């Protein structure tokens, strides 16, 4: 019901209160800023979520490499430090059952199954298209999903709340980082409980929004 | 049946053997070893440090030297343990000067004595080490995945000071590393699946 207006656009959302701050902090400024230029929520392509859907992952800023106004400043400047506000809203009726785990994995090293070969460039950075979990039970990094709750996360249940809002500050060892090289965070939606319905197969869309709030840029060129 | 020790400082800090090597020495008529002193080799310390993302600590290196027998008796050798920091190129023309350059820190110790103990400070460009690095090495655009050029401590180089000694004894060197002043950030899930390779996170299952 409550609309969240940031910049020149906005998206109808559920009431936003007591939103999750990752590790109990918010993306403050480093002790020009894009509160206008690149501000508004960038809505990615809605993924079709079915009963046999393993999951999806979008690294930050992998899905944002070229998006709208933000796609220009990626290759334009030398360094940046940016926070992220991620709002994942999944619309469904009261007759659908299931659960979706939206968790942000800082510093996610992916992996492969039953081989020692390291993934290539196209396998790691997929751009806006995003990837699909090969084995979501092991998270693809070799760890376990049961203890994966240690990260910041929110629960989307078709009973209680159909949306989630996660705020990610700047997490890095360096004050700034390289746009096309290192991925600080990772956005993952994990369907712990699959879909179920009266019909054999249904389709539940998922909307994902990411706002690069309170960031900076240096090294002007081009 | 029926918080002091639970602290992270006491949890991550323990004495473990990160390098085990013994070079065969009988008759040469060379002898040395160098290694990157990384925590991904020893399996118990790896998973011990896979729990956390970024780590800040000062490595404390202790070299223990034992001499075996392949009654003569054990002579006392003089050994030199030199630490080579990252950025020093190694064009090895052995028998001549690189080891003895005054830039690199070296230490001399005998066989019978308290074990040589040195404390390596924190050397990094960034604020802390990166155990999990999502990205590629440098900017090669296809550069190596999973290895961050920003964090490399260096190579630990150890050789015997004395010349060839006519014995058939094998020298065994043990290097223990106990970190101190440990600061932790971003705890992660443990990895139950075995380690296929130390170069990346691939799992078998």
């Amino acid at each position: 019901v409550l609309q969240l207006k940031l910049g020149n656009s906005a998206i109808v959302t559920q009431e936003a209160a007591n939103y999750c701050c990752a590790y109990g902090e918010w993306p403050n400024y480093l002790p020009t800023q894009p509160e206008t230029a690149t501000d508004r929520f960038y809505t990615l392509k809605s993924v079709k979520w079915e009963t046999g859907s393993t999951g999806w992952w979008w690294k930050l800023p992998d899905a944002l490499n070229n998006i709208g106004m933000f796609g220009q400043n990626v290759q334009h400047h030398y360094l940046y430090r940016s926070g992220f506000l991620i709002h994942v809203q999944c619309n469904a009726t009261k007759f659908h059952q299931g659960a979706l785990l939206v968790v942000a994995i800082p510093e996610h090293q992916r992996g492969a199954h039953n081989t020692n070969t390291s993934p290539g460039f196209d396998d790691i950075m997929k751009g806006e298209e995003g990837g699909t979990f090969n084995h979501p039970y092991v998270l693809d990094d070799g760890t376990s999903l049961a203890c994966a709750t240690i990260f910041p996360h929110q629960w989307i249940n078709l009973r209680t709340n159909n949306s989630a809002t996660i705020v990610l500050p700047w997490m890095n060892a360096a004050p700034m980082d390289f746009p096309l090289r290192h991925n600080q965070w990772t956005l993952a939606i994990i369907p712990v409980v699959p879909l179920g319905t009266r019909t054999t197969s249904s389709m539940v869309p998922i909307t994902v929004s990411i706002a690069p709030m309170c960031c900076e840029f240096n090294g002007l060129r081009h | 049946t029926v918080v002091s020790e639970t602290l992270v400082e006491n949890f991550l800090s323990r004495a473990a053997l990160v390098s085990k090597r013994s070079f065969e020495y009988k008759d040469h008529t060379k002898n040395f070893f160098k290694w990157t002193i990384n925590t991904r080799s020893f399996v118990q310390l790896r998973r011990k440090l896979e729990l956390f993302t970024y780590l800040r600590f000062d490595a404390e290196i202790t070299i223990l030297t034992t001499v075996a027998v392949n009654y003569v008796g054990l002579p006392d050798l003089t050994l030199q343990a030199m630490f080579v920091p990252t950025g020093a190129l190694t064009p090895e023309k052995q028998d001549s000067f690189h080891w003895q350059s005054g830039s690199n820190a070296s230490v001399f110790f005998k066989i019978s004595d308290p074990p040589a103990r040195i404390t390596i400070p924190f050397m990094c460009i960034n604020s802390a080490y990166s155990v999990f690095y999502d990205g590629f090495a440098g900017f090669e655009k296809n550069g190596l995945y999973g290895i961050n050029p920003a964090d490399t401590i260096g190579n630990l180089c150890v050789r015997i000071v004395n010349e060839h000694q006519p014995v058939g004894f094998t020298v065994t060197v043990r290097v223990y590393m106990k970190p101190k002043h440990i600061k932790a950030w971003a705890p992660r899930p443990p990895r139950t699946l075995p380690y296929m390779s130390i170069a990346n996170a691939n799992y078998k299952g």
Partner: antibody, heavy 119, light 108 residues
């Protein structure tokens, strides 16, 4: 006991592209990777891509991206290769390898196919 | 893609006269490398994998060593059937690439 079989030639004109069969025997097909290697008459070895048997996860080269399509079948324990819009430029001898957990090696190879296209 | 430089591209040797082929990589692939034998009939067969390790059933004349900046394939004794196309491959990371190759010739 264990071998690989990819017999035949199958020359074809442009407008459609033939799809490879790679069949394996002697080992459990579900637990091992499947690779592909392209031998060009110009002595090119250029590698095509790899596919997982369990999942549909694949990896493609930059220059070969959007062309090659990999699919496998665990029922018949075979492997398929699907191309699109082959022209008079592409001709080569196709190979399919296995790999594994360790070394992901090339140890087992096929006989090879003769692909010659003309306008 | 990471390129594997194989040199020399050709050589001429007689029976015996052990000769090693050296490959160089712009990036560090670790201990993971493979060598492949290519017969004139079109059948490829593996020879050397993971440096010192060798294939079961292949005679001991094939060997390898590493100076740490390079990868070498050493053959103790050559033969009349030992004329093939050798290639060095890196399976450590995707994508997998092939070397330049060397065509062995006989002095006549």
């Amino acid at each position: 006991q264990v071998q690989l079989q990819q017999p035949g030639a199958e020359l074809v004109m442009p407008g459609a592209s033939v799809k490879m069969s790679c069949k394996a025997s002697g080992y459990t097909f579900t637990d091992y990777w499947m690779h592909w290697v392209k031998q060009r008459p110009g002595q090119g070895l250029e590698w095509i891509g790899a596919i997982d048997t369990s999942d549909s996860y694949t990896t493609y080269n930059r220059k070969f991206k959007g062309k090659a399509t990999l699919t496998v079948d665990e029922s018949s324990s075979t492997a398929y290769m699907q191309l699109i819009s082959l022209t008079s430029e592409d001709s080569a001898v196709y190979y399919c390898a296995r790999g594994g957990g360790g070394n992901s090696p090339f140890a087992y190879w096929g006989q090879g196919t003769l692909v010659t296209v003309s306008a | 893609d990471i390129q594997m430089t194989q040199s020399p591209s050709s050589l001429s040797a007689s029976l015996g006269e052990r000769v090693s082929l050296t490959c160089r990589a712009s990036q560090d692939i670790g201990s993971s490398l493979n060598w492949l034998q290519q017969e004139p009939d079109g059948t490829i067969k593996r020879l050397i994998y993971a440096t010192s390790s060798l294939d079961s059933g292949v005679p001991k004349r094939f060997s390898g060593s590493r100076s740490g900046s390079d990868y070498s394939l050493t053959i103790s004794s050559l033969e009349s059937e030992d004329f093939v196309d050798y290639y060095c491959l890196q399976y450590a990371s995707f994508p997998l690439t092939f070397g330049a190759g060397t065509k062995l010739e006989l002095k006549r």
